[PDB]
Design an enzyme around this catalytic site. Structure first.
Site, mmCIF file in Angstrom:
data_model
loop_
_atom_site.group_PDB
_atom_site.id
_atom_site.type_symbol
_atom_site.label_atom_id
_atom_site.label_comp_id
_atom_site.label_asym_id
_atom_site.label_seq_id
_atom_site.Cartn_x
_atom_site.Cartn_y
_atom_site.Cartn_z
ATOM 1 N N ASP A 32 26.041 -28.222 16.474
ATOM 2 C CA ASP A 32 25.806 -26.865 15.991
ATOM 3 C C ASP A 32 27.191 -26.208 15.923
ATOM 4 O O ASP A 32 28.203 -26.904 16.030
ATOM 5 C CB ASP A 32 24.822 -26.106 16.889
ATOM 6 C CG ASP A 32 25.400 -25.781 18.277
ATOM 7 O OD1 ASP A 32 26.585 -26.047 18.593
ATOM 8 O OD2 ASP A 32 24.629 -25.272 19.077
ATOM 9 N N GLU B 140 19.245 -21.031 10.492
ATOM 10 C CA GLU B 140 19.503 -22.254 11.224
ATOM 11 C C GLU B 140 19.590 -23.466 10.309
ATOM 12 O O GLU B 140 20.250 -24.417 10.655
ATOM 13 C CB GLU B 140 18.418 -22.454 12.289
ATOM 14 C CG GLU B 140 18.428 -21.349 13.349
ATOM 15 C CD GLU B 140 19.654 -21.407 14.279
ATOM 16 O OE1 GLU B 140 20.495 -22.336 14.156
ATOM 17 O OE2 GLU B 140 19.728 -20.550 15.181
#
Ligand code: CL
Ligand code: CL
Length: 162
Positions: A20, A11
């Site tokens: 994202d 991540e």
């Protein structure tokens, strides 16, 4: 290596609101704020999550606090899900980390749709699960991450992360 280090690799860490891989406002270690196109909506979700007026920026401690909560919530979503729990209980410790990684990324509902993969995982048909896991929008949109998680399920080792 453990689930926290694994997810920290997959991540990343960013201290300001970012989009994202799907284009959704996110902060910290893959903490999704909102699917809304509105940055003010994201800022409001962020202040709510942190408990103060952030103006889109959080500290490293704050990012790690959300991260701890999200890892915990992913685990608890597995254990409450009738389709995820028995597969998770059947797995060794390293492959359990791969299951949490998937739930963290795509949610309890998403993963629970990998019906065939889950069955193969429960039966310990590792090479076959790996092939089936890869036939997915998941794998086609984020192939490098998905390969690492799939390799973890295939081998039960941390080789893809070392
Ligand atoms: Cl939250
Ligand atoms: Cl990727």
């Amino acid at each position: 290596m453990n689930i926290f280090e694994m997810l920290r690799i997959d991540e990343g860490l960013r201290l300001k609101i970012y989009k994202d891989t799907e284009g959704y406002y996110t902060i910290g270690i893959g903490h999704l704020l909102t699917k809304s196109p509105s940055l003010n909506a994201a800022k409001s979700e962020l202040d709510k999550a942190i408990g103060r007026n952030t103006n889109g920026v959080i500290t490293k401690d704050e990012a790690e606090k959300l991260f701890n909560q999200d890892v915990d919530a992913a685990v608890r979503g597995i254990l409450r899900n009738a389709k995820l729990k028995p597969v998770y209980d059947s797995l060794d410790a390293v492959r359990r980390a791969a299951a949490i990684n998937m739930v963290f990324q795509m949610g309890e509902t998403g993963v629970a749709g990998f019906t065939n993969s889950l069955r193969m995982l429960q039966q310990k048909r590792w090479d076959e699960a790996a092939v089936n896991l890869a036939k997915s929008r998941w794998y086609n949109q984020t192939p490098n991450r998905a390969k690492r998680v799939i390799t973890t399920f295939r081998t039960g080792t941390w080789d893809a992360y070392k």
